[PDB]
């Protein structure tokens, strides 16, 4: 008969009626692959972590409305039991909502079916899809809390719903009521908001505990007074400690000095808090994964955020000052610890090009294009990721320049435009919404439209993706489109069909070896592309996720090594959007580098 | 169809009617790992390499007689094949007599069991078991002849003969015509000695093509003259050209500089001549493997020999510059070349003291000992390797300290001294042969006696070991010996039968465990073992023995550990064998302990 529960007689937590409090990082199981979850947990430990804590994204297991992941990568409970079997408490944070830099929150795009949809409120069809999820979620969860014989202690409901405009106190007590259902009375349900009263407002909630979160910059005691004007007894609780920062692209790399966050650590432990360390270890943003914020700017590929552990799983010199500052509070686990993996520089590695996208629109699209008369979004198209092709027909004749206008800002994110089959330029959301324009009447107008992560933050995460107003050319409001789906996982892995200034966007392919019988190979890597500008790029048909070396701070990507094999060739496949290295008589110039240091924080 | 061949119209070999010059290095496979195998063979590939050389020792085969080992760490014919998917060319030298810092230059002890036996000759007895050998291995050899579709496109005979006393012609005629006999008319047959007339008299064979060697220090347009005498047509052959060179306990670490061994090895691959690499990586001599030098000094349990590869495989500066070298000849192959393993400091394992030898009689020795008059010596006693238990009881009251000494020096090589289970010191092959001792009458009088080494080269490879000849105590002849062999390597696998059958201290066996987690990819990882506070003994990990430890001499202060004997979850058992002094007295466990560190000390003092 297992307790885990707050006593408020004496500002705590008691577990099996003994004072407890938490010393937790953050791990994501859907940034890190399974190959790796035991290496960083085991890593989490032996900092002298009893607990950590991870968010369950909604999207990441319910792609389409009931069609449900929960294997291999996307084994959220074997995550659970893998941290209970290393002696880890687990803080449970299921949302729905998640926001952490994650493609739209979490919430699934397959809600905007409903145009209208007020998310995260009390609005039905929301509340609807929500309940259906927390019905097949929480009772996977229920035989993992503490008081059955699990990990989990407690649960947040939510996140930071005080920063939210809608203030719809109604949806958190229905979030409250399903969840007591789903998980008995005895779990300690919780809220975690900004450490001031303006957001505790519309946050907090008779009926679950509340607690808040802040970094290095804040005046301790003051953050811990306003979470008491809440909750005048119970813990002390920073649920999001920061030991980093996100990264956008286009702007320097995030970082925080170690000396300030172990000072603050250190003060925040000696009050009898508990706390977690967001994050302890970040990883990647593989694939669509990668979230955006308001204005648009979207985050990159690396989650590394200056976190303890790096984002290949490293120790640095931040992991051992906290180890330190942890060993001054708690015995910590003896043994050596896990090392940094080994890194090998595998070299240049030659592509060639293999099509176009527009020729191979047979295999991106083998269930045939959709006509419209004005644009469709990618949510109405029935694509959440990606990119999509619209094309038109050009209706007078363009021998001088003619402007190919967004009025409304409408190029949600990036376009790649050609015209009979000639690169013409670049449309950017809130950057760039006219660009001119040259063919011939009946020519051919291409736009390659890329999603580059929905916004997980503030008042627009309903972010629909796609042409989602009119186009105009020479003011004239273009009509009659052929929109193209494109299947871009399929056709890389099928090699588009055929198995056994700017560029076209294409698809350029290339093959490695990697000897057996070497006990030490193959191991992670780095890739790098220099002289490539802005692209996707899969090894062996794993999307590792998006390269953009002409705006930086991020020009290599992770290469985990268990995705590396040694009894066939390994392919190398790069889509690059805007110019390829590609066209000179040299194609030694046509390749990419693997190398074995990241370089994540290029000026 | 496939030849291989030497053409003496010009000067070079013919492969399949085409010209061919050797680049070699020199690997054995019985100093690395099977599980490292393929992983040093890729190395010496990606350096330029298009050949590989190495030993077949015959004790490594034959431990007893028709009694045979050709299977994982002894797999040689598997080793060929592997070089021949690789796509290297094999040249191979299997003796009988190898030389090579290794027991005995490879042949058996067992061969003593007739005293008076000549090694290397006619001896009519040494021919008729170097024949029954010959029967055995060359057969298995014969299908990796290049022009059956292997690897090996010349064989040595026997190894610098023209070094040894004897000059026996009728020894080389035999193993030239059994060789044929096995392996048919076409391979070339080779010999390869120290390059002046002096080493080439008794050497060099007609019919068997004359090869030199020599190294950094020595004149190249000598030395390749020296084999013109003897072959004034064919090709120039260097088959042992030295990288580096041998250790002894006791002496620095031998080193051999970057620009000496690259320049030398320049000027050799532009005279047009076929050159080998002694060594390439030379790897670890493991259990008792090692050899010695007369008078009496033992290599140690590393060969790193300052090879381009490390004893642990390593790509070193060396390794990069021979690589460099041999790119001004050669196409060297395109691609990353696999990389230095990884190392690992698992750090401070305790370990408490389980039994003394002594107490581990019955386990040792379960057949019981032998009785004699005066004191056998190991190849009598049906011993080859390790130590051997020699026991007596004092004739006389010792209550003053009485004199044991081995007057003709015949201690080999030494031994640990109790009475009635109080240590006396050290007796020592050379160094001391009298130690004074302590005890009552009819006190039992043990000496734990230890082979350090079989001589490898020179005419004192006929060392039987243990106590060669008499002891005295007070200038009498001591009597009545009860002796046991033991067996060590059963002993430390059954955890002194713990596991069942499915200023001196007290020689002992001291244990202890350590984990290493699963799930992990990158644990094990390769590590070496350091034994600060130790003295002299033999460690084992998991019942693999890894040789010798000797930190109080040196040059060596640490031992490699390969990770393939490191297992996870399941706790690693470390078992050493202290001979001498163990810290582990003082009321402070944390002394009783080794530790393991992620870089190698074998360069100190
Ligand atoms: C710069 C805008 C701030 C948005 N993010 C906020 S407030 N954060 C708190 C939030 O709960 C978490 O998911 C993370 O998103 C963290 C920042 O990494
Ligand atoms: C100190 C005596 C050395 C004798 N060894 C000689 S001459 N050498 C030649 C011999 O062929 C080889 O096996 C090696 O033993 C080499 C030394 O590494
Ligand atoms: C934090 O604020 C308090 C008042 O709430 C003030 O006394 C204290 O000095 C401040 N501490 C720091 C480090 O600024
Ligand atoms: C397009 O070209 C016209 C005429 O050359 C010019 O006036 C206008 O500024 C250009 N607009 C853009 C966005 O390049
Ligand atoms: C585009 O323009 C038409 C006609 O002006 C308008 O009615 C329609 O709503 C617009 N469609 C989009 C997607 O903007
Ligand atoms: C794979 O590897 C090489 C790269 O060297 C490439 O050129 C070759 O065509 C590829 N083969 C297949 C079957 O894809
Ligand atoms: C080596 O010896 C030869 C004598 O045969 C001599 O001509 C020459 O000077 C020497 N060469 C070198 C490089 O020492
Ligand atoms: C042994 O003892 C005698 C005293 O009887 C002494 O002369 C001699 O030096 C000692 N020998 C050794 C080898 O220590
Ligand atoms: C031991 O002693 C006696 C001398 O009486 C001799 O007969 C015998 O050969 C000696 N044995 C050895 C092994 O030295
Ligand atoms: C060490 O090794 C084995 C592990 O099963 C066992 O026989 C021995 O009793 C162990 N002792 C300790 C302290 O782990
Ligand atoms: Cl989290
Ligand atoms: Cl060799």
């Given at each position: 008969?297992?307790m885990?529960?707050?006593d408020?007689?004496?500002?705590?937590?008691?577990?099996?009626?003994?004072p407890?409090?938490?010393?937790?990082?953050?791990?994501?199981?859907?940034?890190?692959?399974?190959?790796y979850?035991?290496?960083?947990?085991?890593?989490?430990?032996?900092?002298?972590?009893?607990?950590?804590?991870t968010?369950?994204?909604?999207?990441?297991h319910?792609?389409?409305?009931?069609?449900?992941?929960?294997?291999?990568?996307?084994?959220?409970?074997?995550?659970?039991?893998?941290?209970?079997?290393?002696?880890?408490?687990?803080?449970?944070?299921?949302?729905?909502?998640?926001?952490?830099?994650?493609?739209?929150?979490?919430?699934?795009?397959?809600?905007?079916?409903?145009?209208?949809?007020?998310?995260?409120?009390?609005?039905?069809?929301?509340?609807?899809?929500?309940?259906?999820?927390?019905?097949?979620?929480?009772?996977?969860?229920?035989?993992?809390?503490?008081?059955?014989?699990?990990?989990?202690?407690?649960?947040?409901?939510?996140?930071?719903?005080?920063?939210?405009?809608?203030?719809?106190?109604?949806?958190?007590?229905?979030?409250?009521?399903?969840?007591?259902?789903?998980?008995?009375?005895?779990?300690?349900?919780?809220?975690?908001?900004?450490?001031?009263?303006?957001?505790?407002?519309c946050?907090?909630?008779?009926?679950?505990?509340?607690?808040?979160?802040?970094?290095?910059?804040?005046?301790?005691?003051?953050?811990?007074?306003?979470?008491?004007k809440?909750?005048?007894?119970?813990?002390?609780?920073?649920?999001?400690?920061?030991?980093?920062?996100?990264?956008?692209?286009?702007?320097?790399?995030?970082?925080?000095?170690?000396?300030?966050?172990?000072?603050?650590?250190?003060?925040?432990?000696?009050?009898?808090?508990?706390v977690n360390?967001?994050?302890?270890?970040?990883?990647?943003?593989?694939?669509?994964?990668?979230?955006a914020?308001?204005?648009?700017?979207?985050?990159?590929?690396?989650?590394?955020?200056?976190?303890?552990?790096?984002?290949?799983?490293?120790?640095?010199?931040?992991?051992?000052?906290?180890?330190?500052?942890?060993?001054?509070?708690?015995?910590?686990?003896?043994?050596?610890?896990?090392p940094?993996?080994?890194?090998?520089?595998?070299?240049?590695?030659?592509?060639?090009?293999?099509?176009?996208?527009?020729?191979?629109?047979?295999?991106?699209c083998?269930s045939?294009?959709?006509?419209?008369?004005?644009?469709?979004?990618?949510?109405?198209?029935?694509?959440?990721?990606?990119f999509?092709?619209?094309?038109?027909?050009?209706?007078?004749?363009?021998?001088?320049?003619?402007?190919?206008?967004?009025?409304?800002?409408?190029?949600?994110?990036?376009?790649?435009?050609?015209?009979?089959?000639?690169?013409?330029?670049?449309?950017?959301?809130?950057?760039?919404?006219?660009?001119?324009?040259?063919?011939?009447?009946?020519?051919?107008?291409?736009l390659?439209?890329?999603?580059?992560?929905?916004?997980?933050?503030?008042?627009?995460?309903?972010?629909f993706?796609?042409?989602?107003?009119?186009?105009?050319?020479?003011?004239?409001?273009?009509?009659?489109?052929?929109?193209?789906?494109?299947?871009?996982?399929?056709?890389?892995?099928?090699?588009?069909?055929?198995?056994?200034?700017?560029?076209?966007?294409?698809?350029?392919?290339?093959?490695?070896?990697?000897?057996s019988?070497?006990?030490?190979?193959?191991?992670?890597?780095?890739?790098?592309?220099?002289?490539?500008?802005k692209?996707?790029?899969?090894?062996?048909?794993?999307?590792?996720?998006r390269?953009?070396?002409?705006?930086?701070?991020?020009?290599?990507?992770?290469?985990?090594?268990?995705?590396?094999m040694?009894?066939a060739?390994?392919?190398?496949?790069?889509?690059?959007?805007?110019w390829?290295?590609?066209?000179?008589?040299?194609?030694?110039?046509?390749?990419?580098?693997?190398?074995?240091?990241?370089?994540?924080?290029?000026?």
């Open positions: 008969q297992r885990f529960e707050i408020y007689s004496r500002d705590s937590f008691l577990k099996d009626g003994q407890f409090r938490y010393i937790s990082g953050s791990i994501h199981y859907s940034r890190v692959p399974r190959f979850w035991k290496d960083r947990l085991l890593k989490m430990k032996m900092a002298g972590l009893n607990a950590i804590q968010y369950v994204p909604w999207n990441f319910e792609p389409w409305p009931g069609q449900y992941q929960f294997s291999e990568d996307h084994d959220v409970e074997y995550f659970l039991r893998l941290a209970h079997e290393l002696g880890l408490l687990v803080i449970l944070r299921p949302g729905p909502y998640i926001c952490a830099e994650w493609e739209m929150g979490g919430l699934p795009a397959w809600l905007l079916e409903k145009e209208s949809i007020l998310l995260r409120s009390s609005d039905p069809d929301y509340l609807a899809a929500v309940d259906k999820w927390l019905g097949v979620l929480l009772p996977k969860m229920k035989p993992l809390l503490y008081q059955n014989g699990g990990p989990v202690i407690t649960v947040q409901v939510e996140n930071e719903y005080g920063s939210y405009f809608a203030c719809d106190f109604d949806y958190l007590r229905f979030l409250q009521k399903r969840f007591r259902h789903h998980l008995g009375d005895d779990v300690v349900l919780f809220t975690t908001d900004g450490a001031h009263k303006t957001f505790l407002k946050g907090a909630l008779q009926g679950l505990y509340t607690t808040v979160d802040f970094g290095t910059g804040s005046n301790i005691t003051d953050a811990f007074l306003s979470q008491r809440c909750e005048p007894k119970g813990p002390l609780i920073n649920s999001e400690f920061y030991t980093g920062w996100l990264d956008h692209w286009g702007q320097p790399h995030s970082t925080i000095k170690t000396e300030a966050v172990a000072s603050s650590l250190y003060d925040i432990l000696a009050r009898g808090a508990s360390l967001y994050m302890f270890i970040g990883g990647t943003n593989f694939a669509y994964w990668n979230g914020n308001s204005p648009y700017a979207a985050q990159p590929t690396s989650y590394d955020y200056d976190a303890p552990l790096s984002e290949a799983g490293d120790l640095t010199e931040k992991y051992f000052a906290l180890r330190n500052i942890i060993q001054k509070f708690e015995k910590v686990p003896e043994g050596p610890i896990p940094s993996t080994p890194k090998f520089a595998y070299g240049k590695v030659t592509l060639e090009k293999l099509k176009t996208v527009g020729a191979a629109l047979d295999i991106l083998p045939g294009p959709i006509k419209s008369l004005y644009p469709l979004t990618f949510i109405q198209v029935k694509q959440h990721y990606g999509v092709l619209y094309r038109t027909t050009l209706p007078q004749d363009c021998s001088n320049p003619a402007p190919l206008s967004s009025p409304l800002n409408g190029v949600h994110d990036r376009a790649y435009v050609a015209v009979d089959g000639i690169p013409q330029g670049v449309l950017e959301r809130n950057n760039v919404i006219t660009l001119n324009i040259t063919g011939k009447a009946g020519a051919t107008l291409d390659l439209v890329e999603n580059m992560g929905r916004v997980n933050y503030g008042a627009y995460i309903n972010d993706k796609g042409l989602v107003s009119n186009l105009t050319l020479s003011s004239n409001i273009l009509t009659d489109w052929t929109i193209f789906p494109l299947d871009t996982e399929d056709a890389v892995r099928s090699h588009l069909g055929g198995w056994g200034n700017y560029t076209l966007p294409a698809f350029y392919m290339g093959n490695f070896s990697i000897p019988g070497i006990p030490d190979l193959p191991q992670d890597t780095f890739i790098q592309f220099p002289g490539w500008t692209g996707q790029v899969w090894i062996n048909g794993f999307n590792l996720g390269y953009w070396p002409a705006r930086g701070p991020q020009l290599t990507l992770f290469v985990p090594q268990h995705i590396l040694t009894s060739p390994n392919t190398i496949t790069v889509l690059e959007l805007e390829a290295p590609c066209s000179s008589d040299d194609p030694e110039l046509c390749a990419v580098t693997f190398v074995d240091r990241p370089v994540i924080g290029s000026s």
